[PDB]
Write a structure and sequence with these properties.
It is classed as structural protein. The protein has one domain. Helix 4 packs antiparallel against helix 5, helix 5 packs parallel to helix 7 (104-121) and helix 6 runs antiparallel to helix 7 (104-121). The protein is elongated, with a radius of gyration of 22 Å. The chain is mainly alpha-helical. Helices cover 70% and strands 0% of the residues.
Length: 256
């Protein structure tokens, strides 16, 4: 058996316990990584095998309990556990919700409860994991169930603090750059306004490599939206060119 749940865990995981039983949840909370992976794979199996005749309220409660466990496991240091959480999350969004016609409110809940944690992992000190997490976010943004919600792009363009951790910041600017290229600004969630707010914010970041991606984003936009971009930025003059970024920006525009 997995070790007993702490008193803290029993109350917080009550809805999950109600749905899956204490044994499974104890596995999910176990200090043993194999018990955690097994628990998540068991949740995957339990949800996949739910008959369509299951009352909708039960199916919703089960989704919510599964997402509770997913949200925890997205933080896992062990790759097999993290991967099982992604497998489960992708299944809930792309298979379970549509199978049971639960509605896009449930899809929204899945994304909103997990995206912040997924984004956190893109700040990991190991490149392997940063890439895994960012690629999953990229794929989730483009799933047919998720794209029309316009959730992912909006989350990605939220303020980036100038002192934010380098790996986290780099992953964020690269995600925006990548998804913006692929999705554009029509019905995606990205707009000239929210991209420019994000990118110009990122230009203040302390790390050159971060600012450089922000410049690429702006140059990309400028090619398509010259007037809007120039109207957004401070006006070009001799004084502002004393800062290297703006010299680069405005000279770059003139090069384009």
């Amino acid at each position: 058996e997995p070790e007993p749940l702490s008193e803290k865990a029993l109350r917080e995981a009550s809805p999950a316990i109600e749905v899956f039983g204490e044994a499974l949840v104890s596995g999910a909370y176990s200090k043993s990584w194999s018990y955690r992976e097994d628990a998540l794979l068991a949740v995957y199996k339990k949800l996949m095998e739910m008959s369509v005749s299951t009352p909708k309220e039960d199916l919703r409660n089960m989704l919510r309990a599964a997402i509770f466990l997913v949200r925890r496991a997205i933080k896992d240091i062990v790759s097999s556990v993290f991967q099982a959480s992604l497998k489960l999350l992708k299944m809930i969004i792309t298979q379970y919700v549509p199978k049971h016609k639960l509605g896009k409110l449930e899809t929204s809940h899945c994304v909103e409860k997990t995206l912040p944690g997924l984004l956190s992992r893109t700040g990991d000190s190991s490149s392997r994991l940063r890439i895994v997490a960012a690629k999953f976010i990229q794929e989730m943004a483009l799933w047919s169930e998720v794209k029309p919600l316009q959730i992912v792009p909006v989350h990605l363009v939220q303020l980036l603090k100038p002192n934010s951790p380098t790996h986290l910041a780099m992953s964020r600017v690269e995600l925006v750059e990548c998804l913006l290229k692929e999705m554009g600004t029509e019905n995606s969630g990205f707009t000239i306004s929210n991209v420019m707010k994000f990118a110009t914010g990122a230009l203040e970041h302390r790390v050159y490599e971060v600012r450089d991606v922000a410049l690429r984003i702006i140059f990309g936009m400028y090619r398509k939206h010259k007037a809007a971009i120039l109207e957004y930025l401070p006006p070009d003059d001799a004084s502002i060119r004393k800062t290297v970024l703006y010299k680069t920006l405005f000279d770059g525009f003139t090069k384009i």
